Amino acid sequence: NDYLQRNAIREDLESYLREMGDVTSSNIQNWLGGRLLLVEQTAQTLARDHSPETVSALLEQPALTSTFSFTYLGQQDGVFTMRPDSPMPAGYDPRSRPWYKDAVAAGGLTLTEPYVDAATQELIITAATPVKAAGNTLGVVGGDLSLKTLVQIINSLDFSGMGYAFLVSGDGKILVHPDKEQVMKTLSEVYPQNTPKIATGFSEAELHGHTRILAFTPIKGLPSVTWYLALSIDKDKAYA
Numbered sequence: 001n002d003y004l005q006r007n008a009i010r011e012d013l014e015s016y017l018r019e020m021g022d023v024t025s026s027n028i029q030n031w032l033g034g035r036l037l038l039v040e041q042t043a044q045t046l047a048r049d050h051s052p053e054t055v056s057a058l059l060e061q062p063a064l065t066s067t068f069s070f071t072y073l074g075q076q077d078g079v080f081t082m083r084p085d086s087p088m089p090a091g092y093d094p095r096s097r098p099w100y101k102d103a104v105a106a107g108g109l110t111l112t113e114p115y116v117d118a119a120t121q122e123l124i125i126t127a128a129t130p131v132k133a134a135g136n137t138l139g140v141v142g143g144d145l146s147l148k149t150l151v152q153i154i155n156s157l158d159f160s161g162m163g164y165a166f167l168v169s170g171d172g173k174i175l176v177h178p179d180k181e182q183v184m185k186t187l188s189e190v191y192p193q194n195t196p197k198i199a200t201g202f203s204e205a206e207l208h209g210h211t212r213i214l215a216f217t218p219i220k221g222l223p224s225v226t227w228y229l230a231l232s233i234d235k236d237k238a239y240a
């Protein structure tokens with residue numbers, strides 16, 4: 001009867017959303033991965049040669065400057081070198097920054113959560129890794145990514161007009177979202193009454209007057225972090 005057909009329709013939809021979540025998660029994994037690779041390659045080059053002349057020429061290579069807003073080296077002694085140039089706030093110390101600390105704590109590649117950029121003052125995410133030469137940490141290489149760029153990547157398609165995608169941490173922190181007002185809120189703040197759980201399937205919740213279906217897919221291949229690709233789908237539209 002109705003209930004079994006209700007379930008048949010629901011499972012069909014969940015199957016479709018699962019597919020979508022999978023290949024969308026892979027897409028963002030692979031996009032982020034190319035950037036992680038540049039940072040890794042850059043740090044490994046610097047481990048062998050970090051003279052001021054090499055640092056300058058390296059950070060100026062177009063494969064970096066056309067990929068990141070800024071690419072930079074923060075050294076163990078606090079010295080900072082960045083391309084391209086920017087006005088910089090007084091007091092700046094790269095060793096105090098989230099990207100530096102996250103990279104050293106991970107002992108290798110990392111992605112920060114959004115943090116307030118020192119110069120542009122906007123939220124950004126950074127790919128970073130320590131520069132290690134024979135066990136000696138010389139400093140950390142970082143490359144900055146705009147949140148705007150990331151929302152574009154995971155929202156390449158509009159899911160038949162059913163909804164959109166966002167990024168969220170395992171602890172429920174919204175990292176990247178089409179709605180700037182939702183960024184760095186938690187799932188619990190956005191959904192105080194009936195909070196979607198990250199494990200391990202599908203949830204309904206109410207947003208802006210409408211029932212949405214939320215589904216979370218792990219993003220693999222992100223070193224040191226546990227992030228999910230979330231689909232947020234208008235429920236009534238989806239079943240139509």
Ligand SMILES: CC[C@H](C)[C@H](N)C(=O)O
Binds near residue numbers: 072082086094119126
């Ligand atoms: C100017 C920005 C620097 C390079 C980095 N994104 C930071 O805020 O620490």
